[PDB]
């Protein structure tokens, strides 16, 4: 991998906090495109272009990281909505900082932290994003992170990133972004 930032290369003073209004939008789980075949050419490609991993242990990989019973997800400047089972539930937020982390394999990466301001959001009331960036940019698509005890917990699941593209996108158009 190239020493960029996307690749989690990058100097910690770049870093820069964000807002809740970078990632407005709705937007979609990938997790059914996995399981519906669409990204098999996504992971047949990935093991021909890197030969790190097969097939299918590239898509095993790529199972436990999608996985997610949240299908979708609506955010605002100030508010997320997460659709889950058969409910929705939206909260309010607030930004509360960043955090970098460092990974098995010597790259980087920084999580844009989120706590909601309602008292009842439970597992929701803890949010973070992932996408690849550390700096204010509109996101394309993101990893997120919900749970309900503290921003510090999540800071430990390293293998589970349930990951989200916009709405107005086909699935075969999800695979065609992760094929480039
Ligand atoms: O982030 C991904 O989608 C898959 N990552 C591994 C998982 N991520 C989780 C995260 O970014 O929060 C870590 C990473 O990309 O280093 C490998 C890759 O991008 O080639
Ligand atoms: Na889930
Ligand atoms: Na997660």
Known sequence: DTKTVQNGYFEDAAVKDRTLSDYAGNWQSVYPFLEDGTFDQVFDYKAKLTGKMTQAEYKAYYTKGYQTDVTKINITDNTMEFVQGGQSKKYTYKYVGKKILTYKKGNRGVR????????????FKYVQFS???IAPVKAEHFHIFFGGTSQETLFEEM???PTYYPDNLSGQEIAQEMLA
């Open 159 to 161: 293998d589970n990133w």
């Open 112 to 123: 844009f932290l989120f706590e909601a301001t309602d008292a009842d959001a439970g597992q």
């Open 131 to 133: 996408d690849h960036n």
